[PDB]
Design a protein around this ligand. Sequence first.
Ligand SMILES: O=C(O)[C@H]1CSC(c2ccc3cccc(O)c3n2)=N1
Ligand SMILES: O=C(O)[C@H]1CSC(c2ccc3cccc(O)c3n2)=N1
Length: 258
Amino acid sequence: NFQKVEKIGGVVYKARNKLTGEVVALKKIAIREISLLKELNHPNIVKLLDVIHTKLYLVFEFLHQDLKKFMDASALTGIPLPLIKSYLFQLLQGLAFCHSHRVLHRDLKPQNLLINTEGAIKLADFGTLWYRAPEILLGCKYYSTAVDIWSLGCIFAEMVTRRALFPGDSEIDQLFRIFRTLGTPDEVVWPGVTSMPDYKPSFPKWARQDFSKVVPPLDEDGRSLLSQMLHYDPNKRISAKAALAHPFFQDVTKPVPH
Ligand SMILES: O=C(O)[C@H]1CSC(c2ccc3cccc(O)c3n2)=N1
Ligand SMILES: O=C(O)[C@H]1CSC(c2ccc3cccc(O)c3n2)=N1
């Protein structure tokens, strides 16, 4: 039925549908979540074409490559700001759509963001440590859409600087890397943080970095938006919908990537 072409990322393969000649991404691995997922159409969400239960196989549209590869390829010169802005804007549209339908992504990272030759970018693999929100790291079981905004913020910073923002090697290292940059959170900035399941009063108390240093040479509009995406308190973190109205996107366009 499907011929595997190569492994590209459960497990995901490039494959040919012999019944249609279509080239697809085939993921080899509750039904309600998938239903909701399947019914969604948006230009910035990878389309789920078919679900085959026999092991569960999810058949997705196939896209050119992922943003990780593009960023590695662009590491020498960087991604031009207009393209960064376009990608961020598009990802926020996708998230705004998902979130309005009560769908969380929860594992956003460059490897899960797929691009095409025409300037589009799409969200894929709906649910490393590097893009995990602090509330998840502190043991929150009942987290919100805000976890996706944190992750996208980390990705935004990485596109700009050509370095991962918080490349932890363990959950505690991840948390402490966050704390060393943004300051150790307290009840003032994050009411309720000290009652979180894995919060320990013995966490070292670091001061916040002046931030100027975190994503140079991003302009103040960009820094403003990023800071709103990285608020500790998930309830203060900007929503995708509001982020779309941020002045950073006043001059947004849709360039064609190299
Ligand atoms: O994990 C997933 O849900 C699936 C959605 S499609 C996808 C995927 C994952 C990696 C890919 C790499 C190159 C080109 C692609 O189309 C890729 N597609 N992963
Ligand atoms: O979550 C936020 O929006 C930011 C607002 S500033 C802030 C913060 C969080 C923790 C801090 C710890 C020591 C010194 C500081 O200035 C700190 N600042 N968190």
